[PDB]
Amino acid sequence: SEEEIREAFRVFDKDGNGYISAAELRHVMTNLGEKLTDEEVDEMIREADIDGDGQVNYEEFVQMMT
Amino acid sequence: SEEEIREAFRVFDKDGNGYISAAELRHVMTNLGEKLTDEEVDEMIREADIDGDGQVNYEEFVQMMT
Amino acid sequence: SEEEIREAFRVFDKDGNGYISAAELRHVMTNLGEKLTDEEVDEMIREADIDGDGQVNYEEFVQMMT
Amino acid sequence: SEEEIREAFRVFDKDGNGYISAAELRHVMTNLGEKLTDEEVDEMIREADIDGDGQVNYEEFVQMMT
Amino acid sequence: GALRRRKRLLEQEKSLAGWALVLAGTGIGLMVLHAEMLWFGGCSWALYLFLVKCTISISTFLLLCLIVAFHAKEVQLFMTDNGLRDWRVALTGRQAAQIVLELVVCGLHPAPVRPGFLGQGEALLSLAMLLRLYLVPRAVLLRSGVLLNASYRSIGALNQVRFRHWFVAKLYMNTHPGRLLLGLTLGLWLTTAWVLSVAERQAVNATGHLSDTLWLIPITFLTIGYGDVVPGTMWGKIVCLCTGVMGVCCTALLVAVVARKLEFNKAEKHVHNFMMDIQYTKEMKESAARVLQEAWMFYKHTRRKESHAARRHQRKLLAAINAFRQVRLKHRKLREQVNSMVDISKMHMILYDLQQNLS
Amino acid sequence: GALRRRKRLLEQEKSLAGWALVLAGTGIGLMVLHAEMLWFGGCSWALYLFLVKCTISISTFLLLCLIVAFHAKEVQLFMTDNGLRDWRVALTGRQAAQIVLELVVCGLHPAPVRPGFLGQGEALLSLAMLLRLYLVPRAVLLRSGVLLNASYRSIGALNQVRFRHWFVAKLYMNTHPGRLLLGLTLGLWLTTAWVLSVAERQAVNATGHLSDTLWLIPITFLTIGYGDVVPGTMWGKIVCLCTGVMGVCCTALLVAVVARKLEFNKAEKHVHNFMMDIQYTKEMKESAARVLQEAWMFYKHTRRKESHAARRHQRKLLAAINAFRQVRLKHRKLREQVNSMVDISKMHMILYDLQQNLS
Amino acid sequence: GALRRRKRLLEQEKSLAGWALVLAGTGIGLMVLHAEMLWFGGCSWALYLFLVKCTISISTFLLLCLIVAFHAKEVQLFMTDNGLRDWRVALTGRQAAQIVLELVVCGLHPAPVRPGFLGQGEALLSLAMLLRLYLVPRAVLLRSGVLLNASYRSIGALNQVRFRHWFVAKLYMNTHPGRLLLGLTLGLWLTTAWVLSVAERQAVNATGHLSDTLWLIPITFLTIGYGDVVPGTMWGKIVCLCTGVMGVCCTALLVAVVARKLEFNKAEKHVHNFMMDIQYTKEMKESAARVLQEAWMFYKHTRRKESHAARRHQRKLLAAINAFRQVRLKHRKLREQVNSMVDISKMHMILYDLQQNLS
Amino acid sequence: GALRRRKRLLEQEKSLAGWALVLAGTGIGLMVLHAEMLWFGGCSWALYLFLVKCTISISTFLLLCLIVAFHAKEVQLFMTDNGLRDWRVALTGRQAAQIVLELVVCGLHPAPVRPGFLGQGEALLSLAMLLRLYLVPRAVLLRSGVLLNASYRSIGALNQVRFRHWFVAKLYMNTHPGRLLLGLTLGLWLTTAWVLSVAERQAVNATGHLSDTLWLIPITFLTIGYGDVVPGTMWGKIVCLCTGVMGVCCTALLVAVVARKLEFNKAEKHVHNFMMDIQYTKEMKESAARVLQEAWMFYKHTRRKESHAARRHQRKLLAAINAFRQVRLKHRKLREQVNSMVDISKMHMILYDLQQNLS
């Protein structure tokens, strides 16, 4: 299902560069989807924040999620 | 109506030369059409027979008919 | 609505030059449209007759009308 | 009907060379068609086996059948 | 040219088609008035039943004068069109029998030759007035602009339309369906109800007049057929069969009209295609987020080693990626149809581009 | 060649298809005459009820001779077509059972073996005469030119039409809808009315003959169903169900015929498209003038400083420019369809032009 | 920009279209409650028949306030759209007559001005409440997204759709046929049954209430018409004709819906075309083997000089090669249609290929 | 690979879909037998009415075992397809409610818990057996080859067909219309007639059994509605409304089927176009001769100076040239359509020719 996860990320890849901003990565779960928890979103930022530079290359993030 | 007469002759112009044989000119009225009289067909051959060579250039024949 | 006025003039621009004759400009309101008053048409000719040469460049006439 | 016989052979000509294997020639009557007799298939191999090399050029076989 | 005279004759035929229709309708109306006056009035009103009966004769003599004057305009139109000089050539043999068949049908009024029943004789002559209703398609065809323009007759002769009554039928039915199909059935109900009331009168107990047949005719026309009133006479049953046949034909016409009026044209297809295009992208984003939330939450509850509260999110993850693949494959075939609509004219322009590009 | 003989056999089959149909119809007619003569005549006419009953036997023996003579022509046609020399090869096994099933069905007349009722025996044999109506599609197919031309059989073998009875059904229904669909329902009404009158006779009070069933059958066929007369017997109800089923099927056929007969073809679309093209330009000019009048009159009443009598002309100016934009956008999409009609053949010609232009 | 204000007014019109519909439905419901309470209760409940009758007046005053507030939003929308500054210009003359025709129709309640029958006066005012059902297409059109987006009004002004009520009719009927066509006929049956029960009450023996008309209305609607109950009054017959007309129209609508829902689209045509492609090749091989078996067995029984047991296999050989030619010519025209489906887009791509190939 | 196991499970689902249908039909049959045996037999046969009533319980226990065994195969198929290893993940929450809703509906038999009427209790449980008829579309879908091939599921996943019950509906209706639409209505007539006979029994005078309802149901279905028998009970009227609704729906289905089955395909259009092409040239020659005869005979009778016997031939000359222009302009637009049919593929081949010609 990793190809489906990557294709779901590729919807929000408006840059076509393989990286997505933490603003859009918070806004996708925050404003849309099923629901959003503030502590879970902040813990998601804490888990994905091995870099913490405002942009995440999601290709390694898919492998860390699976 | 002379154009319609010439276009009616042009149906039986299988040579595309402006001349039709007396065999076909007898067979068109004889075998098809409304009816055929033998004496009227022979008088038609006698009237059109200013040449009498087995072939009639119908372009002057239209003018003689009208 | 000045663009709509200019596009309504452009129906009667059969020359494509930006000028229309006073004959056609009288005939458009006179023979067609809602109605035509003779004194109002003559006053329209008196108002548009800053030139009075039988042809009117309607592009300045639109600005004078609005 | 010899053209129809040759066109029926040409369905099983997956090589396009004019020759068909005795394996496929046994399997066509054996596994499909109306029915298959073992002694009739072996007698068919005995009749067509003027060569007996595992491949039959069916073009002469059509002439021997008709 | 004679094309100014040819068009001039087609306003003298339009007026003679209209005024003949007026003098036929005013004969039919006076026939209905006479038939009802002889029923509600009896033998006491024997003066007015002579006055109206001879007014019908005056009107039908004027009608027999307004048809010879029409066919004279048609034979003058024929001489003007094909370039003749003698009317004896221009008249046909079958046409001159159509003249007689038209003058006989337009002359079957009940004349003043000599309790409220019409009698076996004049009740058929009174209903033969309705056979004048062939004057209305002629008048409709002449009032329409397709025959009344030689610039239209040129494109008709290029197409061999040949001035059919059926082309204006298709025309008025494709342009104005509901006005025509609403007026026609009400006219059929009133006309057929009156004819059935003539066929069934029943002076004892008043059981045949319009209070019964105005209920019996639509119930037959719509093929309901309760059966509380049925036709009683042999002539009533013919009318009630010819009502049901027209009801089946008008239902079969209504089905085709309503079937044409439901499809989209080009321009409504475009705005439908845009309303779907702004709507599938919302779900393309929403279901993507629904994948991405559970995609992390299942890994979270897996790394937290709670295997009971992770299987539910794995179940929702499978459901969400199934929904996402459905909405993505649904989204791409819409845009395939968007690319499919602009195929032909763009290739027709690109051909003209690549033709000039070869030089 | 043998293609002169193959065509020669198909006039010997056309005649044997026609004369068999004549000798079947003249058996059905004499059956109807016998069934009515035994009802209106009783036991007094026992001579004519023997004479007609044996005339039927003579006619059906001639019919059983005109079918063997037909199938012999078909087996000679088969030998001529596929190049055979023995008839024992040419005959099939299922075909020789079709021969027997055809000869049995064409041989069920009421024979002269031995008050006005037929009896339980011969009333079924008399109605088994109507099963001869399979001789009419064969005769219609052979009289049509599609089977009777090897130049037509060549294009049929190129298309695998295989001489269906359904292709001539589609043919006669696309060419002559109203003649076929008018004759067929009247034939069904008369035939089914007579069969129902056989099923329901009621010698007491005469309540079952054609004066009732000629009213009951169309009312069932059109699905009105008043219910003043209903079928009374178990055999009458089967006939009144098979009438309603055919009524639903003929209405479903009429809907499709009337749906095809309303659309335009190419040539009527062109003259409709021209009648609209000369008509929208009139309003394109009229509404333009309606803009231009108010456009000056509002400025006049504004410069005259009468603000009360200027707002009305501003209102009409807004309405007129709204109508002008509507008629202009309506006018341009018509001419878009005018450009849309000539797309394909013009590109097919421009491709052949640009192919030669490359050299 | 003012396009934020223009969209802002179209949520103040959506709410004023919804709440007006609620305050019209709660007037119709209280009207039905009053009409049934005055029948089942008589003159004893003269307090509640004043209370409900004035509750209707309070509700219809709130409705007459929720329409002026709607048309004020429309005239502010008109001033915002076309750029005006005075409302006296923005209002039309025919629109201000539509205001009065809307306020009169929405104000015909039975007021509390002053055995179980309503009377000749207030029974028409009570049924004039149902004329409020023009508030539902307005609310449906405003709740739909086609009017409520200037990005949709842009493509509509490019297409001249002009916010029709008929476009959302085609939209909801092409998207949700069965929900709409199932809810609509049940709503018609209940509403028309109640109106017929008002028209036919019959206090003696209780022969007109919903236990009769809930059976009479669907039997009329489906055009069955048993006739065990028929309408008795002149006002009942108008309702039973307007039920049959709507029944014919809904059947004509259902025929077109079911006719659209049977054809294949592109993608179902592809999988049908593949299921046939894997299936005709099986018979292409099977019938080939059926040729090839008899092809040798006939030569075997010929060389064995048994001429009686060889003619049967020659017969089967002819039948098998006939079946093989049928299945081969059937198989190739399927793949012709497979080649026919990919014609246009492949040529559109090959044109762009050969354009670049010229350089 | 596991694609051999995935196909292996879909023959274990086909058998469990067939044998569940057999054990549901043999429960429905024994229910009908019990309901008729308790009516024709009374209280004397109290042994067999216990024996059949417990045979139904044995059969429905076997049915409740053949559904759990089916859904186990579906959850193993789900684990094999999406690659799982625990069944607790593979099962859904809404699916496990569908299991319970399926087992309850398949378990409503009249059990042997404890004059010929069933009673208010068990007459509803006996008719709840018919709710087992959802087992037939599942069995039809599994016996069809579209689900039972992963090579078909590949093209279905390329098309998002998603194994609908509606696709095989369109499939069996486009392939076999008449067999399906003939078997379905007879099955509806027998089933609905029996249910109506249950709803209306009337032990006095035997006025409710199948001899009445087998006549009442088709007359309602075809919307005839004589009205000689009407439903009497409140439960009979619901059944007679649900018969009329299905009758309207089947008529609306038949109209679309007969509308598709009348148009020509490609190959019948070609042979029609050739039969007209060999036929218009005959009249193109015949009418040309009809011009040419009178063209000389009018000049003959003109030169003979007989002006009375020349005008008739001038009249026929005008008629003949009119007919000749009609048949010529009719003849050329046929051949225009002949040129119109071969447009696209010939341009697709000429494009590939001119592409290679550029080098």
Ligand SMILES: CCCCCCCCCCCCO[C@@H]1O[C@H](CO)[C@@H](O[C@H]2O[C@H](CO)[C@@H](O)[C@H](O)[C@H]2O)[C@H](O)[C@H]1O
């Ligand atoms: C497309 C086909 C349409 C068919 C249309 C034909 C319609 C014919 C209408 C019926 C006309 C005659 O119908 C008949 O009228 C006569 C008088 O004329 C009336 O008959 C009544 O009056 C006559 C007076 O002569 C008495 O003798 C008679 O005893 C009495 O029944 C009846 O009402 C009706 O039986």
Ligand SMILES: CCCCCCCCCCCCO[C@@H]1O[C@H](CO)[C@@H](O[C@H]2O[C@H](CO)[C@@H](O)[C@H](O)[C@H]2O)[C@H](O)[C@H]1O
């Ligand atoms: C597509 C299916 C079509 C089904 C078509 C079948 C049509 C059958 C027509 C009914 C034939 C028999 O119908 C029956 O005829 C008999 C005589 O034969 C008549 O019966 C009458 O005469 C017989 C003479 O034997 C008496 O004994 C009897 O008491 C009396 O009712 C009735 O009129 C009818 O009940």
Ligand SMILES: CCCCCCCCCCCCO[C@@H]1O[C@H](CO)[C@@H](O[C@H]2O[C@H](CO)[C@@H](O)[C@H](O)[C@H]2O)[C@H](O)[C@H]1O
């Ligand atoms: C699209 C068109 C739709 C048409 C819809 C029109 C529907 C009209 C419904 C009928 C309304 C009046 O219908 C009529 O109601 C009155 C009371 O009002 C009732 O009439 C009854 O009560 C009145 C009280 O005044 C008594 O005087 C009268 O003797 C008695 O019949 C009847 O039940 C019905 O005859």
Ligand SMILES: CCCCCCCCCCCCO[C@@H]1O[C@H](CO)[C@@H](O[C@H]2O[C@H](CO)[C@@H](O)[C@H](O)[C@H]2O)[C@H](O)[C@H]1O
């Ligand atoms: C899509 C919706 C379909 C709706 C289908 C529902 C069908 C229901 C069928 C009716 C079932 C009950 O129908 C009813 O049966 C009962 C027995 O059960 C019978 O009733 C009869 O027997 C009962 C025995 O208890 C007596 O008490 C009663 O006085 C007598 O009328 C009637 O025949 C019928 O009124």
Ligand SMILES: [K+]
């Ligand atoms: K009916």
Ligand SMILES: [K+]
């Ligand atoms: K009825």
Ligand SMILES: [K+]
């Ligand atoms: K009906």
Ligand SMILES: [K+]
């Ligand atoms: K009825």
Ligand SMILES: [K+]
């Ligand atoms: K009745």
